[PDB]
Structure 1
Amino acid sequence: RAPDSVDYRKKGYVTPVKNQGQCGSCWAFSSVGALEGQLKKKTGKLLNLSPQNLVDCVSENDGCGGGYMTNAFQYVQKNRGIDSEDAYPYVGQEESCMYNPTGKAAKCRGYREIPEGNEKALKRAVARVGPVSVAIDASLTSFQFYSKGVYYDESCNSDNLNHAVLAVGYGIQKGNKHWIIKNSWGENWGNKGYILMARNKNNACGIANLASFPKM
């Protein structure tokens, strides 16, 4: 069995919470979070990678109009690299692709998908691999006002995925099982930019419906 709780923040695999601003770039933050995890695991280095690189250059995605993490990992593969945040800083508006090989800070050898709706497999992937990119319904007012505790809302729609976040761990808070979720809505949203989302409550908010992680 994988451990009963895992928190990659404790192991230095997770960079500070970012703010996407007025740009539908959640998919780009999710993607860099998962690549930042694999980079810490494989090199021992924790550094901010470049969401802007993905926003401006993933031509299969729609920049500030939205995107998929799988598309981003395929781009980092084909492109033979992703820049550091330092070499390709975040603007929060879509600009023409300015990828600079000099600033390359990680590569990607492909990616894997979690079987759709399978929270057991998502748990094993987080334990075995590290932080995993996930998609959720974040449309509910209850989501936007989250403060503390383990978030569950029966009105959450697992067939309405509209937001990309990062599962950096999982655990059990006073008997309530959860996913530890890094958002990209700033340090002052939720609990310092994080939300605990209900785990093993019938794929709540579709947490295991579009999960993926990069190979490195």
Structure 2
Amino acid sequence: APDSVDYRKKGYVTPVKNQGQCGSCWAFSSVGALEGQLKKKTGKLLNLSPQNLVDCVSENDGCGGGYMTNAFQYVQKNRGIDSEDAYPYVGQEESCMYNPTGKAAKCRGYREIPEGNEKALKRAVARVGPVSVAIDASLTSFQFYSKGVYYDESCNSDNLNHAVLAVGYGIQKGNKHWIIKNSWGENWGNKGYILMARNKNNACGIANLASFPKM
């Protein structure tokens, strides 16, 4: 263990989920960050509801994509977000079914990492916890990733098409990286995660759309 951190070993990360056919990566990413702050603030965490966000964040497009900051704003204005148990994931948008009795967390706003600043993202991951981020995950090599530290210069930092969650950082075999939680199931990548090159010119745009909720 070098100059690094891995929140999976600290109870700040819930099990890896599978968004299914639905383009809800942004909802899983948002919930992931919210869950981390729930643990930081209260000492306990709980699977929050991605469906709640898919069905109720009108500024977003449901299974057609969306932004994490919009989700954080919703939780704030809504005065809460339901737990997974109270508002189960069905993988398809349905009418907003938010129920305050199932509230499991709330937030008072959010902060965005300065665009392209990986040092700032590193500081946020160390001082805040899991951070919602967006990347270019369109490359076939990204999708079939299995191990090691992913680095492909063909990645387009101007084409963020998938939202994920930075749950740590460190170094493998001399290769600095970010520990990334995806939402394509535990069967994807390495147990649901991917190690992405860190301090390599903001590879794949990892620090271009990073944010976290405030509690």
CA distance in 2, matches of 1:44, 1:114: 24
Tell me by how many angstroms 1:10 deviates. 1.1
Deviation of 1:90 (Å): 0.2
Contact preservation (8 Å) 1:20, 1:92:
yes
C-alpha contact 1:184 1:193 (8 A) present in aligned 2:
yes
What do residues 120-169 of structure 1 show as CA deviations (whole Å, max 9, x unaligned)?
A: 00000000000000000000000000000000011000000000000000
Q: Distance in 1 between matches of 2:196 and 2:18?
A: 20
Which aligned segments of 4 or more residues in structure 1 are displaced greater than 3 angstroms?
none
Please tell me whether residue 157 in structure 1 is matched to residue 156 in structure 2. Answer: yes
Q: 1:3 to 1:125 in 2, by over 3 A?
A: farther
Contact 1:3 1:127 (8 Å CA) reproduced = no
Q: Tell me the percent identity.
A: 100
The SS at the match of 1:87 is coil
**Does the 8 Å CA contact 1:139/1:162 hold for their aligned counterparts?**
yes
How does the TM-score come out when normalised to structure 1?
Answer: 0.98
Which residues of structure 2 form unaligned runs of 5+? none
What SS is found at the alignment partner of 1:134?
A: strand
Give how far 1:44 is off: 1.1
Q: How far apart are the structure 2 equivalents of 1:6 and 1:158?
A: 25
CA contact (8 A) 2:2 2:171 kept: no
Deviations 1:164-189 (A, max 9, x none): 00000000101100000000000000
Aligned equivalents of 2:107 and 2:63: distance in 1? 23
Separation (CA, whole Å) in 2 of partners of 1:99 and 1:178: 37
Gaps of 5+ in 1: none
Contact 1:156 1:204 in 2 (8 A): yes
Distance (Å, rounded) in 2 between the aligned partners of 1:24 and 1:180: 22
Contact 1:165 1:183 survives alignment (8 Å): yes
Give aligned pairs, total. Answer: 215
TM-fit CA distance, 1:47: 0.9
Q: Deviations over 1:50-105 (max 9, x none)?
A: 00000000000000000000000000000000000000000000000000000000
Secondary structure of the 2:35 match is helix
Aligned residues of 1:167 and 1:182 also touching (Cα < 8 A): yes
- SS of residue paired to 1:10: helix
Displacement, 1:46? 2.1
Post-superposition CA distance 1:185-216 (Å, at most 9, x none): 00000000000000000000000000000001
Separation in 1, partners of 2:199, 2:44: 33
User: Quick check: 2:6–2:167 contact (8 Å CA) kept in 1?
Assistant: yes
| 1:3 Cα deviation from its structure 2 partner | 7.4
Query: Taking structure 2 as the reference length, what is the TM-score of the superposition?
Result: 0.99
Cα RMSD over matched residues? 1.1
Kindly indicate whether the alpha-carbon contact (under 8 Å) linking 2:2 and 2:170 is maintained by their aligned counterparts in 1.
Answer: no
Mapped contact 1:19–1:185 kept (Cα < 8 A)? yes
Instruction: Tell me if the contact between 1:77 and 1:109 (Cα under 8 Å) persists in the aligned partners.
Output: yes
